[PDB]
Symmetry: D2
Subunit: 493 residues, 4 copies
């Protein structure tokens, strides 16, 4: 019950853990779409395949869906498939000649008038967010092109047009994206494109949605609506990208099935040092709520084209694990990168190294101390189950969970041993790929039996733990099953 | 306590702490050697000026020494001067290197440091405990008050860390040098181990090398570099170091200003009570009076929500011993020695007020010193009328909980 | 937790607990030997009938045995029968007495106990651990399931208490006998030591002699006697004993009714969580599965505010192991053995439900036994629809937190 | 931090403490009034002389006041003098022939009509509490003569007379005292006699009042008023005698300077087993509030005429200490008893024995955990001071306190070592005699100096601790002085 105290007992020469808890999400692109590249990516350490719907067509992502499924079947594994929406955007219009040279100290005008959409100049151009005039006060800032161009609003010239000062010299081109830092953007949760994309994901049976630009709890339910009745079991992981998402994180977590800390997106509007703190907050909040949380963007970026990443990047990845992250994400590194297998292998190695220094008992003790008394049964059973692991120095857990609820609930309390989930659902096997320290074994109930006495499923989990070398004769194994409200401290034969 | 539970209570839109605890060490080079550039550094947040004795001549470093003192005197502040030795010198990564502790150049350079009254030594490439004794005897009797801070550069320094910490006056964690033979992931962990051990031992720890290296020739650092600095603070670092960014860099002031900004932001998130409670719980009972006095004083801060501490300490020993227990308020050290003011610049959360015992009084009742400490705490806006201030003085064996008038 | 902090939360005008945890042992004599007088005792709160073999003949005690079984059968309950030996026999108070563990009469009386199927022995004047083995071999192989409860009567019993507790199945604290050679004030302390040690060992402890002695010939006890009983409960006694008050007394029922009243009132004040937390904190980590299971089960009671526990235990070992951790709710033991029902009458906070495995089923899935336990807990009004009930069963290695229908 | 855990480490053969913390109050009567009997009583273990103003005249108690002061001066000690008020009472009237034979099942009538005061019979008699008709409902009980005669009210016969059933056979005589269990008695805080007696106590300079029959917080201030301006420094110890006092204990403690648990008085109206619990509550509440609490009445009663007390009585005394009592009281045992020196000696021995088994750290930890944060300075300094004792295994404390406030405040947190109080006031030396674990040293400020640097007073305390053999060269001594807001861990030379 102290990371500091745990640090004192550590030695960087002692062998690393016999299991890696943290999970790796790789983005699939030109470098990784083929079956063999995926087979290499899985073997490297991929648990979840991310599809970026900012780019590519339905036919393109269809082959991704196909290839992942074939590479999963050929290696005898279950791989989660994630759909990352493009999301709603605020962009500039077009320009005459393509460019707009913005000199420092110059005055320019931004308008929501659609007549200027096709004919923008350096003096006056279009921004497609109709509510820009009522959202932005004078004194506020407009960021254009990944926050490189910074304009300051001086005054409302009319109903649609704002007078601005160019604060720094930078050239912009056609349809560059804009940000309104410190302004409340009221764009709909899902774009017209999203609605079409989300329906494709449901029709193809995606395991989860990484929902872009989530700003309030109301929006989480809008994505739910957009998924329809046939996708009620698809997880919604909400991407926090601006101050709104940070400000409303409590109610958003409550509605979401999980959170993605998108540091790159956040760092456009918020200073980088505050985003680092926002990361700490968001991860800890998710750990308390039992929901999966992903540390995403700018993870090991230099390795996209270099054989090895910078020392600071490695540090960043380890501290993601130290923060308490369920998952670490890779974007361009696996999508457009030169070292797809290599970047995943090293990230896996960094997670494992951090995990070997991490003190899980701190997580267990903190989360348990925060729980309101009286606890509900499911909460009591899972926390006690993890307590028993520490109490008896058990070497594995077996959780029987159909939906994944109690598997996640157990994982929350952070035992210092592998969790084996035995489940009657393949969707569950896949969706648990974003929860740390859990590995799933599928039990075909319609083939093998209803297993009402639970004997077979428990036996299946114990065998898996024996096969991976977690337990042996004489070891204790904490079994928790049916929610799930029952616990045994089993002696492994 | 926990960091986790504290993280839940936080908002990034809240105002940051009204004081910065972590200290900034700047390497002095061509782009920062002039008195006007040093004034820029001091105002930007430099607490310690470092001289890299791998490069340059005694005359070049004499200029550094002279200009630092001139710059500090003009701004009415006290700045530490550090001498970073060249050391003994290709690397062997599963072999134990038995090169001499200090080179012939080192023994000469170290004598130069004594003559020029440096505050501290950054002794390079320390592998064992006896090697600290070599730096000690090389500094002679005239430099026995100079702090020896050990640079951990290889596995040997890590493996023997406990004996090295005991002999030294502090530790420098040179990530880059460690990275040559030890994988980067293991260096991140070694950093935690080394920093945590130094906190328990109550000895200054410096997080050095590859801090904001991109900012040497770029106006802003990479996002990963920012996090590295913040996490250095979160680990429990007393100090953060800038090498090439201030010595040969293009933005000497901006980098120091930004490192200051990151440290303060990280500190605003940091739960000081975790440090206090952890370090308290590791203490053998029975305690020694001075240890018990200092830990109780910090406990009294948390229990009464005191907004400042005042520590009377000539040597700075009890000033360091108080900072060890990490109160969530500023510490003000009232000292009769100017070298202590400078030497405390590597200890976090402490600010020094010089009291001229030669031209005021010995202050046996200690009233004038304490009042001077409170007035500085009023001056910086830490405390106002109605606030509590925990005063610890003389091993400093007396505690007062004082109501600010 | 604390008793102190709990004391602040209390009001004497609040209703008392809906169950009595402490158990009452009654000595059977002339004024209570008849089946109608024993029915009076059982209804008044007798859990254990004691036979003093210092007086009386085998035929007299045979009547006691017969009448107790008849009385219990008519009231549909299970009552324990205890055989308190005469022992070896002036006293020496700084000298170690090496009289034989059991006398010739004892060996004969103990064989009588086996033949008549007594539940437990109160072995008199136990001084060492080997003396327990003497009682064991005297009881033979046919009485190997009979509990040996040791009477601590002199300093030797106190000095060797740790080895005696380990060998025995429980301890009797005979204040009066201790008082002969040990000052009364030191006996009060010895009582605490002995009772606390027995709680940690998870073995029954009886507070005996001079309990309500005034009530033998008076309608009410002295105020000091009342407090003595209450403080016996507060100390952590499983049982409280009546000697002459029920055997030769004038108010056999009233005294038992009053002892019951005092125990319940004391229990209403008692903080069970202090016992749970203290006894938990003394456990060596790693734990054994059965120990961890039982302690977790009680922890689950406190965390979910379960109103009852159901323990499946043939021998009663896990029933005792659960009661060891002192939940603030009733424990219900479902057992296939009638001797266990009787033997659990010296363990606090446990009530037994007999399950006839010969004329119902073995119940491998254990469903019928658990349901029988819940139904009794419903019957006594401990739990209703919506309440939680912690079920521990098979070393009993499986825990369930069940919602009552 | 567990009495249970502490019990495990105990051995009844290990030598007892080097100091007795608990304080003994002896009642002075026919057996103890003379100087030599008091000199024997002090040497036996008396700290406070109790004067019972239920009996005796002003001239009688005057000699007590005198003799105590002479016996104190002759032994070089400071002895506290306590005035115990008679209090307001509800009594029956007189009877014809002196007796009234009350047979079970009989009907009788109680009236508040003053015409029946001098001529009572078995059928109808007087009770002097005018508000009896409005206070007592039918179904309630009237206790007469130490609760031996029990009447049950059947009905209101008229405005002044109640019909009653005699529930048990018992003969009563003239002016026997009555109790109304479960009824709210609204008699004034102080009787006419009390007002005269309290003024005598102020004029003679008594250290404290044991105020009888305290039922509410308002009443505590009435005694204060009755003491006048010249007695504002006289402690008010409130005697809790019925359910009202128990029900209102929180506000009564807040106003009082301390509490007396009068078990005998309480046990008249409340079942004995509930009074035992009431004792636990009241003592613990006082310990938290920092006020002295006395366990009184029926302490070692059989020793009034027997050479040795019953085993249960010894047990009762020890458990008084275990409960957390500051003081243990003696009534008839020292007043009218045959063994005045003997009863005090044994009580002292029992307290010391209990103290040797008691775990003070439990008291320290519990009380400290309950303190609201932020603490005030005085609270912080004293608790830290006691913490330092445990932290450094110090062997004595020195508290510089003029009024006694910080001495009491330190004593509250229960260090496992003697507290030495250095004070500029003799009244303070005396009044601290009811606070456990504290011994006072008088420092004549007008004679020796104002000691603004505190050096002399601290030196005086340390010497006393050395003289009593508490500390020696090498030992740590925790000094706390000026309220008092300063602490030193001093190395004893
Ligand atoms: O914008 S359109 O492309 O015409 C368009 C088409 C369809 S579709 O026909 O069902 O596919 C929509 C279905 C459901 C919508 C919901 S809701 O979740 O169902 O309540 C809310 C909004 S709103 O913008 O937030 O008010 C919608 C806006 C626009 C929609 C749809 C919305
Ligand atoms: O009852 S008497 O003997 O005539 C009598 C004589 C005096 S004395 O002249 O001052 O000595 C009283 C002084 C002060 C009194 C106060 S108070 O504390 O001053 O407010 C209250 C009440 S009360 O009964 O509660 O209303 C008093 C009742 C009776 C009093 C006195 C009372
Ligand atoms: K985006
Ligand atoms: K670990
Ligand atoms: K080097
Ligand atoms: K902070
Ligand atoms: K005997
Ligand atoms: K209770
Ligand atoms: K009275
Ligand atoms: K003690």
């Amino acid at each position: 019950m102290s990371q500091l105290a745990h640090n004192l007992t550590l030695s960087i020469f002692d062998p690393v853990a016999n299991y890696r808890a943290a999970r790796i999400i790789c983005t699939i692109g030109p470098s990784t779409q083929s079956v063999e590249a995926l087979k290499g990516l899985i073997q490297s350490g991929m648990s979840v395949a991310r599809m970026n719907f900012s780019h590519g067509s339905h036919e393109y992502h269809q082959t991704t869906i196909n290839n992942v499924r074939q590479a999963a079947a050929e290696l005898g594994v279950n791989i989660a498939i994630a759909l990352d929406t493009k999301g709603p955007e605020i962009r500039t219009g077009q320009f005459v000649g393509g460019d707009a040279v913005m000199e420092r100290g110059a005055t320019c005008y931004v308008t929501t008038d659609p007549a200027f959409a096709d004919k923008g100049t350096k003096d006056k151009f279009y921004i497609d967010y109709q509510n820009l005039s009522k959202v932005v006060r004078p004194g506020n800032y407009i960021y254009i092109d990944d926050g490189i161009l910074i304009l300051q609003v001086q005054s409302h010239e009319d109903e649609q047009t704002l007078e601005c000062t160019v604060t720094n010299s930078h050239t912009i081109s056609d349809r560059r994206g804009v940000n309104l830092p410190g302004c409340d953007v009221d764009l709909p949760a899902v774009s017209a494109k999203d609605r079409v994309d989300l329906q494709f994901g449901v029709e193809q049976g995606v395991d989860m949605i990484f929902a872009s630009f989530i700003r309030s709890a109301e929006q989480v339910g809008d994505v739910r609506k957009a998924l329809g009745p046939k996708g009620r079991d698809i997880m919604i992981i909400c991407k926090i990208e601006n101050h709104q998402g940070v400000q409303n994180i409590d109610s958003i977590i409550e509605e979401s099935d999980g959170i993605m800390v998108a540091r790159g997106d956040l760092g456009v509007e918020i200073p980088a040092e505050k985003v680092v703190v926002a990361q700490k907050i968001l991860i800890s909040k998710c750990n308390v709520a039992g929901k999966p949380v992903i540390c995403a963007t700018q993870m090991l970026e230099s390795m996209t084209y270099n054989p090895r990443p910078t020392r600071a990047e490695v540090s960043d990845v380890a501290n993601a694990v130290f923060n308490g992250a369920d998952c670490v994400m890779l974007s361009g590194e696996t999508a457009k990168g030169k070292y797809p297998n290599e970047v995943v292998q090293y990230m896996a190695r960094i997670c494992l190294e951090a995990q070997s220094a991490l003190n899980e008992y701190v997580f267990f003790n903190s989360i348990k101390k925060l729980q309101h008394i009286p606890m509900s049964a499911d909460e009591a059973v899972c926390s006690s189950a993890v307590n028993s692991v520490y109490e008896t120095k058990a070497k594995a857990m077996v959780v029987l969970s159909n939906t994944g609820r109690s598997a996640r609930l157990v994982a929350k309390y952070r035992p210092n041993c592998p969790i084996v989930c035995v489940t009657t659902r393949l969707q569950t096997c896949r969706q648990l790929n974003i929860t740390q320290g859990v590995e799933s074994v599928f039990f075909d109930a319609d083939k093998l039996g209803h297993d009402e006495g639970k004997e077979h499923r428990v036996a299946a989990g114990v065998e898996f733990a024996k096969s991976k070398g977690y337990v042996q004769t004489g070891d204790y194994c904490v079994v928790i099953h049916a929610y799930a409200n029952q616990t045994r401290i089993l002696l492994v034969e």
